[PDB]
Ligand binder design. Structure first.
Ligand code: OGA
Ligand code: FE2
Ligand code: ZN
Ligand code: ZN
Lengths: 6, 484, 8
């Protein structure tokens, strides 16, 4: 799964 | 702000904010981004899918596809880079194997665990050993009669739990094969629990604290002897009316949101679940009643030698070695079956295997009789945490504050009233007196530490005022003792 | 988060 955080 | 970066939520660029944190997941079909919370996934699912299909795409695309089980002997069972590495305790491969040689670990000596038929025999044996003030061995009580431990009548199961607590109630859950903890809905747990034939992954929750659920808190309670020695229960009594009012008048009131809430847990686990060795937080004691199913505890006494091995084991990066194999035969096997109850004092090192689908009610507590061992375990935790990194929520909540409050609200008051008379505390309160000195000495250390490097709810100033007052009353009492 | 009893 492709994820990200900001 | 590019439209691409808008959550198909929620349709915002910033989630309002369990906690979304600030994390997103993208759809492998429509390529739109969702905040984790807006994605329809629960936390336990965040690492499971190689291809994630959002709710809007699922109908024409199918379910999300999960990684293939490439390395069942690793916590990262989904990573091809780990295939060649060692077998980790307790990945799926480790547990399946452990299950086949598990019954060879030795039984305990009679010095370590005492087995009694019921709670009346427990009471008798407990008293011979000096009771709570000398509580040092574990007890397995076959039949709960006599313990005055309120429990649900058999037939009660996970189904009633989810109905009482609510389907959307989130509980911190162990993903056994990954040896990690994630949030999961109670309803979501129930579903996986019902499907006994299809269990790619195993789940076991230990942390459903229900002391704040008005229905549950009446259905499962600690044994009476526990309620009577619990330091938390002493400080936040579940009291009403004039009793409660006097609590307020005396300034002995304490906020409900400050209360360590660890005395009423519900535990449910799938067959083949394994929890690795640990000592319960704060070196708290434990009651543990098996409502349904079966547990196998692997335990080691709280000796300096065992603590040294355990501390080394916890701080070592190694992951392939079962603690029992380096502990020089200290680890003992004790089976607990449906209806049976385990009572564990401070400091016992233990791991547990769940051979069969289970439902357990238990709780943790601190008590004056185990104060020295409780502090020894606090030191043990602090030493370990100097090395690794762990979340606060896996340690005893407000440990230090609790002791400040207990000293101020309970111990100080008793030494003061004693002082204002005769009055040798050895003649009727030796246990209170010896505990005061143990707690005081440990609190002096905490003070010292704070004055060398500042604080981290109770101002430095208030602490010093309590200590000064404790020292005064203690010195007064000993002078009453240098006389008599 | 480690596989261990949790009290937040
Ligand atoms: O039940 C389990 O698998 C583990 N629980 C404990 O170690 C505990 O209750 O002290
Ligand atoms: Fe435990
Ligand atoms: Zn959103
Ligand atoms: Zn999509």
């Amino acid at each position: 799964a492709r994820t990200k955080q900001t | 702000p590019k439209e691409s970066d808008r959550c198909g939520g929620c349709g915002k660029f910033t989630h309002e904010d369990k906690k979304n944190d600030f994390q997103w997941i993208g759809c492998d079909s429509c390529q739109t981004w969702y905040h984790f919370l807006c994605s329809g996934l629960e936390q336990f699912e965040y690492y499971l899918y190689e291809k994630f299909f959002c709710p809007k795409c699922v109908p024409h695309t199918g379910h999300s596809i999960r990684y293939k089980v490439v390395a069942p002997h690793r916590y990262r069972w989904y990573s091809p880079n780990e295939k060649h590495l060692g077998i980790e305790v307790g990945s799926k491969t480790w547990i399946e194997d452990f299950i086949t040689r598990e019954n060879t670990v030795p039984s305990p000596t009679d010095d370590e665990v005492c087995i009694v038929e019921d709670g009346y025999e427990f009471r008798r044996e407990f008293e011979k050993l000096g009771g709570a003030d000398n509580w040092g061995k574990v007890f397995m009580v076959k039949d709960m009669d006599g313990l005055n431990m309120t429990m649900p009548k058999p037939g009660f199961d996970l189904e009633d739990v989810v109905k009482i607590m609510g389907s959307d109630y989130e509980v911190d859950t162990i993903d056994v094969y990954n040896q990690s903890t994630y949030s999961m809905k109670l309803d979501t747990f129930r579903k996986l629990f019902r499907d006994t034939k299809n269990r790619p992954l195993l789940y076991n929750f230990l942390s459903l604290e229900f002391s704040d659920n008005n229905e549950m808190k009446e259905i499962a309670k600690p044994p009476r002897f526990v309620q009577e020695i619990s330091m938390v229960n002493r400080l936040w009594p579940d009291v009403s009316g004039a009793e409660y009012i006097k609590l307020l008048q005396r300034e002995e009131y304490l906020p409900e949101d400050q209360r360590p809430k660890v005395e009423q847990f519900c535990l449910a686990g799938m067959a083949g679940s394994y929890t690795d060795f640990h000592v319960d937080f704060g070196g708290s004691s434990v009651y543990y009643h098996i409502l349904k199913g079966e547990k196998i505890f692997y335990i080691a006494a709280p000796t300096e030698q065992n603590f040294a091995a355990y501390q080394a084991h916890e701080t070592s990066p190694d992951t392939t070695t079962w603690f029992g194999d380096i502990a020089n035969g200290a680890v003992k096997r004790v089976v607990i079956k449906e209806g049976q109850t385990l009572l564990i004092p401070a400091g016992w090192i233990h791991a547990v295997l769940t051979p069969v689908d289970s439902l357990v009610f238990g709780g943790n507590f601190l008590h004056l009789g185990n104060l020295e061992m409780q502090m020894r375990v606090y030191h043990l935790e602090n030493a370990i945490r100097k090395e690794i990194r762990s979340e606060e929520k896996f340690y005893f909540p407000n440990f230090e504050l609790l002791h400040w409050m207990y000293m101020r609200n309970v111990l100080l008051e008793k030494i003061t009233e004693a002082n204002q008379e005769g009055s040798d505390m050895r003649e009727q309160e030796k246990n209170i007196w010896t505990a005061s000195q143990i707690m005081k000495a440990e609190m002096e250390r905490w003070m010292d530490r704070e004055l060398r490097l500042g604080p981290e709810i109770l101002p430095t100033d208030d602490k010093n005022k309590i200590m000064i007052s404790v020292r005064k009353q203690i010195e007064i009492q000993t002078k009453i003792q240098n006389a008599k | 988060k480690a596989a261990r009893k949790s009290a937040p």
